[PDB]
Paper text:
Thioredoxins (TRXs) are small oxidoreductases that contribute, in most living organisms, to the control of cellular redox homeostasis. Indeed, they reduce disulfide bonds on numerous proteins involved in several processes, including antioxidant defense mechanisms, photosynthetic carbon metabolism, and protein folding. In addition, TRXs have been suggested to control two additional Cys-based post-translational modifications, namely S-glutathionylation and S-nitrosylation, by catalyzing the reduction of glutathione-mixed disulfides (–SSGs) and S-nitrosothiols (–SNOs), respectively. The redox activity of TRXs relies on the presence of two Cys residues in the conserved Trp-Cys-(Gly/Pro)-Pro-Cys (WC(G/P)PC) active site motif.
In the present study, we deepen the structural features of CrTRXh1, providing the 3D structures of both the reduced form and variants in which catalytic cysteines were mutated. While the subsequent catalytic steps underlying TRX-dependent protein deglutathionylation and denitrosylation are yet undefined, the reduction of protein disulfides implies the formation of a mixed-disulfide bond between the CysN and a Cys on target protein.
Author numbering: 1 to 112
The structure:
């Protein structure tokens, strides 16, 4: 129950990145896997933050095994990974399930 946009394909990924560019809003992405406990531990927080920052920050989810072409091009190797995209390109990242660092990352880019 939040505002996260699920990415199903490279085409969908490219469209969302272009939307963030056109809107001048930052995108935060959770690259996640069903088999990762840490991903499960932080997924509820990602969803809550998508509500708290609705209208300000765009939240995407990429299941790395469902959309392997996007995970590979993004250079993912540990789960969860969070990226921030601005102007169609990567601007920031976090790897791991630190709730404090995720909250701070979203706050930073919402305030920038």
């Amino acid at each position: 129950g939040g505002s996260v946009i699920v990415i199903d394909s490279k085409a969908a990924w490219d469209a969302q990145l272009a939307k963030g560019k056109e809107e001048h809003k930052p995108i935060v992405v959770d690259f996640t896997a069903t088999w990762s406990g840490p991903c499960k531990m932080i997924a509820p927080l990602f969803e809550t933050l998508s509500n708290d920052y609705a209208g300000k920050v765009i939240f995407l989810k990429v299941d790395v095994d469902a959309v392997a072409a996007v995970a590979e091009a993004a250079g993912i190797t540990a789960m969860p990974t969070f990226h921030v995209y601005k102007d169609g390109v990567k601007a920031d990242d976090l790897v791991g399930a630190s709730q404090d660092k995720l909250k701070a990352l979203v706050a930073k880019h919402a305030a920038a």
